[PDB]
PDB file of C-alpha atoms in Angstrom:
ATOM      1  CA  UNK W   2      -9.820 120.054 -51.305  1.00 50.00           C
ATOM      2  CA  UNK W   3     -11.739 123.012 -51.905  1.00 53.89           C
ATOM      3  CA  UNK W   4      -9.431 125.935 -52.717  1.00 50.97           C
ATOM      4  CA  UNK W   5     -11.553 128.810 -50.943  1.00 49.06           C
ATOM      5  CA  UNK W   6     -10.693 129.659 -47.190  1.00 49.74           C
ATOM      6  CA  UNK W   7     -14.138 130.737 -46.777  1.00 44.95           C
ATOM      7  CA  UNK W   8     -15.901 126.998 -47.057  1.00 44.23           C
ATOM      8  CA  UNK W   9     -12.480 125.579 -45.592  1.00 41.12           C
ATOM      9  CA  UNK W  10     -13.219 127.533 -41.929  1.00 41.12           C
ATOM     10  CA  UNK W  11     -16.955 126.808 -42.692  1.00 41.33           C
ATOM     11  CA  UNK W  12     -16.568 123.253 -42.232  1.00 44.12           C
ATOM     12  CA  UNK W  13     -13.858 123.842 -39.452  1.00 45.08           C
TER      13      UNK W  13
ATOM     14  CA  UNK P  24     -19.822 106.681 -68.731  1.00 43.55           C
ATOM     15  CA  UNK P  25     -20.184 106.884 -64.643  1.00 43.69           C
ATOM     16  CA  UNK P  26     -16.911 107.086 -62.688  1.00 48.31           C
ATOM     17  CA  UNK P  27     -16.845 106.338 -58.948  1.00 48.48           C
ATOM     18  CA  UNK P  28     -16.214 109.324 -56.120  1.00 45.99           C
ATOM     19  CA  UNK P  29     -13.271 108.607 -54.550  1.00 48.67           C
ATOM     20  CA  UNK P  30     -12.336 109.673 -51.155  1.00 49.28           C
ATOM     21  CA  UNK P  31      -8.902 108.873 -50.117  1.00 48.52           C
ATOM     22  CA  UNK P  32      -8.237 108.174 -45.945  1.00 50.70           C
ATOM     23  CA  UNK P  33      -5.276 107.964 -43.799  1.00 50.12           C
ATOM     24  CA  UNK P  34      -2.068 109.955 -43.778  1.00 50.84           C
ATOM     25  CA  UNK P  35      -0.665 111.431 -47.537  1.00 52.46           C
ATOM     26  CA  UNK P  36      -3.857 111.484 -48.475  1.00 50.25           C
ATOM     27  CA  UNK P  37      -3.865 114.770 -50.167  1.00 49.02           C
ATOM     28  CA  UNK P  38      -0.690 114.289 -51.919  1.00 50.20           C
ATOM     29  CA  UNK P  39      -2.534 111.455 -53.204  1.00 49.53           C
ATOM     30  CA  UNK P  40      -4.991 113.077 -53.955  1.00 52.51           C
ATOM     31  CA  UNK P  41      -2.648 116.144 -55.768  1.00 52.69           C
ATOM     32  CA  UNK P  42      -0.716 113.346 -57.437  1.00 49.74           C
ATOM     33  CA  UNK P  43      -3.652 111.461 -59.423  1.00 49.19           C
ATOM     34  CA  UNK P  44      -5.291 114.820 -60.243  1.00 44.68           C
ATOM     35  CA  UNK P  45      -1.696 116.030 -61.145  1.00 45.98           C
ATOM     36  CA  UNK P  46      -1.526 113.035 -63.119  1.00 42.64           C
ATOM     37  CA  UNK P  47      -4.357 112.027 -65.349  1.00 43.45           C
ATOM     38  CA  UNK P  48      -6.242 115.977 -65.787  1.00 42.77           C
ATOM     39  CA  UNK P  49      -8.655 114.087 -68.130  1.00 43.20           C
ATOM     40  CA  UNK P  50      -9.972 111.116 -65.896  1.00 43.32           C
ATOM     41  CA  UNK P  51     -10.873 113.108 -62.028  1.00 41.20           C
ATOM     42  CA  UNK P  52     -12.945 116.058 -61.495  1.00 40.97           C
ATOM     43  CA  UNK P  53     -14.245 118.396 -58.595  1.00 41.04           C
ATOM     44  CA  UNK P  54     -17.538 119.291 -57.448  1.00 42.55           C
ATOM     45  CA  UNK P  55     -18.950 122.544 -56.760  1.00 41.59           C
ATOM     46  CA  UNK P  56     -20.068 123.226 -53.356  1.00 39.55           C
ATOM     47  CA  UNK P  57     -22.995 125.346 -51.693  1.00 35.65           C
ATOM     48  CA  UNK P  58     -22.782 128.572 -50.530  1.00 32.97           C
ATOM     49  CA  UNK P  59     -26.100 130.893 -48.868  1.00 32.63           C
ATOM     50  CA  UNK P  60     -23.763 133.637 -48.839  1.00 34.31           C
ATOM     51  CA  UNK P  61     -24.865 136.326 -51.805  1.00 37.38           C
ATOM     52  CA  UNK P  62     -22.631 135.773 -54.878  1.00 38.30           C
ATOM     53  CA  UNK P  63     -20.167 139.058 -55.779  1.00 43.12           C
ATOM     54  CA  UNK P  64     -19.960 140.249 -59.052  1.00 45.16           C
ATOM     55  CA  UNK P  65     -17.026 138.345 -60.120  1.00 45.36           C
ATOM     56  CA  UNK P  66     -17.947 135.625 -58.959  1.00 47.74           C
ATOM     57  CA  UNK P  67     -19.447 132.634 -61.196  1.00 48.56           C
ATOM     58  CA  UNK P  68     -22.381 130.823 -59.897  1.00 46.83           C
ATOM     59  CA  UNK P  69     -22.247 127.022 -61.170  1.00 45.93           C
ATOM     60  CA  UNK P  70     -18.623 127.634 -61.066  1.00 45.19           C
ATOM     61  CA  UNK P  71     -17.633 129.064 -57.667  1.00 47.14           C
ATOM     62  CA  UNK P  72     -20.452 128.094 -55.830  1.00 48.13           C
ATOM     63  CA  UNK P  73     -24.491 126.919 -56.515  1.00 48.82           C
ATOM     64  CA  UNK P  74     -25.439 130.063 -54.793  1.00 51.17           C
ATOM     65  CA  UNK P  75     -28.359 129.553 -52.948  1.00 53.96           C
ATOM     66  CA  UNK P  76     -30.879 132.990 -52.638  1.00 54.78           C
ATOM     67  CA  UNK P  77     -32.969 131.108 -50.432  1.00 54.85           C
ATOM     68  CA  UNK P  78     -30.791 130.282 -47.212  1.00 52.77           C
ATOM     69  CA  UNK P  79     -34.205 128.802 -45.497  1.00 51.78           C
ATOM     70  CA  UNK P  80     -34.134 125.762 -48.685  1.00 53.50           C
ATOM     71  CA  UNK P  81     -30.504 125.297 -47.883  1.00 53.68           C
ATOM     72  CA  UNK P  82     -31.082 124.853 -44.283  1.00 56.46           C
ATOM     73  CA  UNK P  83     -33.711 122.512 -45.039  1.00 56.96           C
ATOM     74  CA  UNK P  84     -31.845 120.481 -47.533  1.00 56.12           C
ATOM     75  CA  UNK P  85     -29.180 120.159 -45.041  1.00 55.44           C
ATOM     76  CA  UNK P  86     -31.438 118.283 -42.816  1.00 54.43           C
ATOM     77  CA  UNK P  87     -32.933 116.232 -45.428  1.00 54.64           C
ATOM     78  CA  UNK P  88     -29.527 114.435 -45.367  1.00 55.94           C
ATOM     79  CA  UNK P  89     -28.701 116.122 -48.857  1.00 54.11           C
ATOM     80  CA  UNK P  90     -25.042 117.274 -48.020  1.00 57.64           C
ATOM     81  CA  UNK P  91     -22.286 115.163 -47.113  1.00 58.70           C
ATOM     82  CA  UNK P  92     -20.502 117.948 -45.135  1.00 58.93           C
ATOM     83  CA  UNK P  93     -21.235 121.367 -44.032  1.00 58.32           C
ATOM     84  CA  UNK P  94     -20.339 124.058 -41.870  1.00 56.66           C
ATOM     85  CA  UNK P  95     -21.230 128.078 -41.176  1.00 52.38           C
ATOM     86  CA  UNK P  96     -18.775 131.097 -41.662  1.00 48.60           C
ATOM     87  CA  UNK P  97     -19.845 134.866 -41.371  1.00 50.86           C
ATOM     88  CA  UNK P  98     -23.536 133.453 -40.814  1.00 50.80           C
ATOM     89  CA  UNK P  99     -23.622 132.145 -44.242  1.00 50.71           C
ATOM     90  CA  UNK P 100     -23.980 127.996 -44.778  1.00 49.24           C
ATOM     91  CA  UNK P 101     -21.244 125.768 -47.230  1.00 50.24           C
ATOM     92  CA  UNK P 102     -21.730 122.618 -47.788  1.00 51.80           C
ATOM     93  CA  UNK P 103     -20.780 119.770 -50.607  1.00 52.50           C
ATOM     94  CA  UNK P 104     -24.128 118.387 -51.680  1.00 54.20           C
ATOM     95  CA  UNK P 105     -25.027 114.985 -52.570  1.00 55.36           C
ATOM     96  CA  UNK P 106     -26.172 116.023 -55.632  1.00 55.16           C
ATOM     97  CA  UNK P 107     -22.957 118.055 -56.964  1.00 56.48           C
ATOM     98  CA  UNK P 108     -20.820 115.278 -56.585  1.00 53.20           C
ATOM     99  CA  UNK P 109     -22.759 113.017 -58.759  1.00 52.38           C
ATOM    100  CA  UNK P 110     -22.942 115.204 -61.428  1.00 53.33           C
ATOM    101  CA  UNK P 111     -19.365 114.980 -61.478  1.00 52.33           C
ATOM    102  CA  UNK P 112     -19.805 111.053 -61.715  1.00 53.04           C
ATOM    103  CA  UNK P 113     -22.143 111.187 -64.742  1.00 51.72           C
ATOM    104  CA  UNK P 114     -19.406 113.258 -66.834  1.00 52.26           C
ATOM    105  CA  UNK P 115     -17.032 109.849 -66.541  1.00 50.68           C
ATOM    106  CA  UNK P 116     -14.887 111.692 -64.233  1.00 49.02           C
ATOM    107  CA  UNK P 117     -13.935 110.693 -61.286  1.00 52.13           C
ATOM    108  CA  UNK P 118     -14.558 112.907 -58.300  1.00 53.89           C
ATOM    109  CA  UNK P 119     -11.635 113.663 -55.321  1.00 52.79           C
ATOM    110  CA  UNK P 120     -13.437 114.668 -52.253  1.00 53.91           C
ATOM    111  CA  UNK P 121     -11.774 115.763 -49.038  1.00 52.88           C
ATOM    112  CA  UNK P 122     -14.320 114.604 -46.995  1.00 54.66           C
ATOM    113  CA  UNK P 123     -14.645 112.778 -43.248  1.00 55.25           C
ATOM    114  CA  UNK P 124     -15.461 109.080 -43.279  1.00 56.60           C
ATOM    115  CA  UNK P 125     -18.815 109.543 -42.118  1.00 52.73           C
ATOM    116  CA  UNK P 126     -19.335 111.706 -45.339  1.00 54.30           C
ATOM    117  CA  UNK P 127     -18.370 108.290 -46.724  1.00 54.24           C
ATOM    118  CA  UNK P 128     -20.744 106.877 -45.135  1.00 55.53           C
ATOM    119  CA  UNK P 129     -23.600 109.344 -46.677  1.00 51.80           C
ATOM    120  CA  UNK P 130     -22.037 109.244 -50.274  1.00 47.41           C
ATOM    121  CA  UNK P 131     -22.971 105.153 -49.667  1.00 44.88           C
ATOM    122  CA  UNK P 132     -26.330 105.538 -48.301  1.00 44.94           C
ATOM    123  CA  UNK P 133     -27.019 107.354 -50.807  1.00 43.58           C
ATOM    124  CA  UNK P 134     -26.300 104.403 -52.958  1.00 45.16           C
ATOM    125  CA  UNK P 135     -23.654 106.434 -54.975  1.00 47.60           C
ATOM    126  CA  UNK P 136     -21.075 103.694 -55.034  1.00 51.04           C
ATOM    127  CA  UNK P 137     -17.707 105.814 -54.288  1.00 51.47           C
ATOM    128  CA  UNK P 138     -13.852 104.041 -53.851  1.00 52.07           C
ATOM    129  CA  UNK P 139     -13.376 104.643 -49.558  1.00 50.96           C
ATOM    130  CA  UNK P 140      -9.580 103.878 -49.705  1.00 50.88           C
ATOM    131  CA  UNK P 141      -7.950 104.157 -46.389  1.00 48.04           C
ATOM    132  CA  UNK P 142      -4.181 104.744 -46.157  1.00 47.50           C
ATOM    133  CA  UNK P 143      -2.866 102.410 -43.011  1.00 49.98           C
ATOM    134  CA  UNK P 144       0.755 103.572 -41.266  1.00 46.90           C
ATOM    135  CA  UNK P 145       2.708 100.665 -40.231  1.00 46.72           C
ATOM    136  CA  UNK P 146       3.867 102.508 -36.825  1.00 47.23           C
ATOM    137  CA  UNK P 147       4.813 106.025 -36.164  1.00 47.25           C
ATOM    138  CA  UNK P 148       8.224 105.885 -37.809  1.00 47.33           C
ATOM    139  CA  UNK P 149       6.127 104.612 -40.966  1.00 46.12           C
ATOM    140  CA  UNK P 150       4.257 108.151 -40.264  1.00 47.36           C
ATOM    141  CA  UNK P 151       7.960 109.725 -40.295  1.00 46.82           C
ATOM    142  CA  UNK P 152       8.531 107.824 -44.064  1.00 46.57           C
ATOM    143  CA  UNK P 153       6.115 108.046 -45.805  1.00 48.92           C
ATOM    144  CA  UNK P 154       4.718 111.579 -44.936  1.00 47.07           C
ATOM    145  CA  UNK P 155       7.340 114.047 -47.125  1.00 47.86           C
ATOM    146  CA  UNK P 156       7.426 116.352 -44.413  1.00 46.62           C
ATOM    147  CA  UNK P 157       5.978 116.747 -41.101  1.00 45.43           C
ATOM    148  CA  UNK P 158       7.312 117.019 -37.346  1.00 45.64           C
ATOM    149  CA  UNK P 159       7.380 114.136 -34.677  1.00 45.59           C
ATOM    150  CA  UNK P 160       4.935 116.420 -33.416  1.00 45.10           C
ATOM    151  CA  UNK P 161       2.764 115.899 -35.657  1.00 46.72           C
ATOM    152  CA  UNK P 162       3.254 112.797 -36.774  1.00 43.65           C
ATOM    153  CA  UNK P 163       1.493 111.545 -33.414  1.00 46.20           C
ATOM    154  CA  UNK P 164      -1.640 112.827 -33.881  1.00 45.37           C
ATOM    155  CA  UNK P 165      -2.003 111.630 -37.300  1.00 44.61           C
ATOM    156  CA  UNK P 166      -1.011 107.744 -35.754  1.00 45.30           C
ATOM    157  CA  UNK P 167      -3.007 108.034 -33.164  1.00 47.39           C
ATOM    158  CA  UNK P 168      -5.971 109.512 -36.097  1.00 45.81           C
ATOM    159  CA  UNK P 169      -5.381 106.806 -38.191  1.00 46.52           C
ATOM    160  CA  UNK P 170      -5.875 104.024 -35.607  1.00 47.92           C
ATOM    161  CA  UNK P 171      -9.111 105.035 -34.011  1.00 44.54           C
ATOM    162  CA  UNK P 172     -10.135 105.855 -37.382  1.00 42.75           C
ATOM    163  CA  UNK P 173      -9.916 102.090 -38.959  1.00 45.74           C
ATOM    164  CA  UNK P 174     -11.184 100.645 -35.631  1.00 39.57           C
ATOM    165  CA  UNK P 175     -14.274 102.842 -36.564  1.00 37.51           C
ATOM    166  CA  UNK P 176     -14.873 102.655 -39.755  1.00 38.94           C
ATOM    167  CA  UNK P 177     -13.688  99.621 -41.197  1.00 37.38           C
ATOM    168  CA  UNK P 178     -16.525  98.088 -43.031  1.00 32.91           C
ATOM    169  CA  UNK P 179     -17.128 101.684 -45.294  1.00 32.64           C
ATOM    170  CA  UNK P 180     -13.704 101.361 -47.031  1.00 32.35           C
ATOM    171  CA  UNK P 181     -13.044  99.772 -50.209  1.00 31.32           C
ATOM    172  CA  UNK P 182      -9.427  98.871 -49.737  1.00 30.41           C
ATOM    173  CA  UNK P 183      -6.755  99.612 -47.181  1.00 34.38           C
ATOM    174  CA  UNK P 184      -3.276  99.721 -48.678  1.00 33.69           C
ATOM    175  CA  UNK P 185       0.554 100.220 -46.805  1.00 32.06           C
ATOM    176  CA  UNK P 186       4.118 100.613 -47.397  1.00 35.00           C
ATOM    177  CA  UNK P 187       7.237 101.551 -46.416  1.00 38.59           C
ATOM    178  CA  UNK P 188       7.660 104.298 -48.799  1.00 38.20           C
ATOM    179  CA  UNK P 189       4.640 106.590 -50.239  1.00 32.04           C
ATOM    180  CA  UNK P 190       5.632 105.777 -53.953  1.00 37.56           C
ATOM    181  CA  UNK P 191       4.635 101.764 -52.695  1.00 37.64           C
ATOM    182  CA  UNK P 192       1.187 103.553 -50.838  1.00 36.30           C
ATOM    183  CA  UNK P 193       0.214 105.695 -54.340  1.00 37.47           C
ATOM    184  CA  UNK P 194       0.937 102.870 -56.511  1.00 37.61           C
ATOM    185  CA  UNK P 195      -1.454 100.518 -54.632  1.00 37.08           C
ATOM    186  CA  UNK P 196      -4.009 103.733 -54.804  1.00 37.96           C
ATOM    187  CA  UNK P 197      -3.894 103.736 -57.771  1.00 37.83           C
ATOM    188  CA  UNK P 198      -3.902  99.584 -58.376  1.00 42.33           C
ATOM    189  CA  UNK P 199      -7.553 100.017 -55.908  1.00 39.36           C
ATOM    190  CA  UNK P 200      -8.905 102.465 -58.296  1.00 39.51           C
ATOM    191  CA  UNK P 201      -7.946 100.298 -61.399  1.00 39.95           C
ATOM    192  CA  UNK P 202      -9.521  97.120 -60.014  1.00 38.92           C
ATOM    193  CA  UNK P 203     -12.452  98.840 -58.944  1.00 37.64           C
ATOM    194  CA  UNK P 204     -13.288 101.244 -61.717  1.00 40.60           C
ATOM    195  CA  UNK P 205     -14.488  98.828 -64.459  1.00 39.74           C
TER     196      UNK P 205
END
């Protein structure tokens, strides 16, 4: 999965 | 010469996912997402992120159907484009995506071919197996996740595998992707 926080909470 | 995205469904999925990546470096890859959010100086554009200066084309783009998932943080758009993941395809490798199953969905209208392989629990004490660790808490909601989910998206997957243990579920992963990567 991507391995940045900021593009995991983007898509959350 | 072009390798299939594959996108990997149902519970363990990303330990799939870790395990065939941890497995064979030379044969999967990962795109590079989107970002409208300015680049910092250490930060590698091509590499971290396409950086996009103008955030009006990105907004556009995203409504010309050209990303297969998106979302906005600190006012700033990310997003996996269509586009990024085949380039991944055309260097043989290929390309683990943690993606929704109606991004599956785009990455076939799009024509792109990928492997949709959805991981089917038995019951809930199949959750409790074959998941390495998890609560009966949370087991639940990944049943009950994985039931709706097939009842809605059957006819976008490639292959659904089971098994008692996970070592049975990766090896038939990994018996989909060899069937289906000629």
């Amino acid at each position: 999965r991507i391995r940045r926080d900021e593009y995991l909470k983007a898509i959350q | 010469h072009y390798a299939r995205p594959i996108i990997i469904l149902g519970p363990t999925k990303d330990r799939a996912n870790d395990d065939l990546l941890s497995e064979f470096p030379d044969k999967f890859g990962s795109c590079v997402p989107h970002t409208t959010r300015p680049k910092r100086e250490y930060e590698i554009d091509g590499r971290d992120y396409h950086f996009v200066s103008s955030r009006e084309k990105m907004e556009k783009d995203i409504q010309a159907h050209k990303f297969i998932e998106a979302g906005q943080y600190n006012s700033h758009l990310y997003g996996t484009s269509v586009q990024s993941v085949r380039e991944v395809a055309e260097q043989g490798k290929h390309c683990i995506l943690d993606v929704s199953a109606n991004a599956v969905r785009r990455l076939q209208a799009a024509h792109l071919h990928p492997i949709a392989i959805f991981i089917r629990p038995r019951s809930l004490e199949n959750v409790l197996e074959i998941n390495k660790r998890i609560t009966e808490e949370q087991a639940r909601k990944a049943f009950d996740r994985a039931t709706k989910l097939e009842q809605e998206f059957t006819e976008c997957f490639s292959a659904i595998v089971e098994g008692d243990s996970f070592e049975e579920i990766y090896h038939k992963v990994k018996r989909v992707i060899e069937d289906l990567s000629g």
